[PDB]
Amino acid sequence: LPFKVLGDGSYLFEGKTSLSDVRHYLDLPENAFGELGDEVDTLSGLFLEIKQELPHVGDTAVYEPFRFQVTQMDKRRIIEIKIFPFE
């Protein structure tokens, strides 16, 4: 599985996970990531589409009701994103 379920209600996903697969694993409606999400294929792509800059570890992005944080990178790529708990 491309994700971890954390005890605090948050999730850790591989950055390359498709938005399709994020919606699948988190039981989200089709429009969860909206028009912006329709422009990209992956969770790290959504982060880049929101922030429009090269990423660093520790960066955050919001697409309500979601909040994302880059928790790990290799030398050039986002490899893990935290999705905070959401209502």
From TrEMBL:
The chain holds residues 327 to 413 of 419 of the full protein. The lineage of its organism: Bacteria, Pseudomonadati, Bacteroidota, Bacteroidia, Bacteroidales. Belongs to the UPF0053 family. It is found in: Cell membrane. This is CBS domain protein. It comes from Porphyromonas gingivalis (strain ATCC BAA-308 / W83).
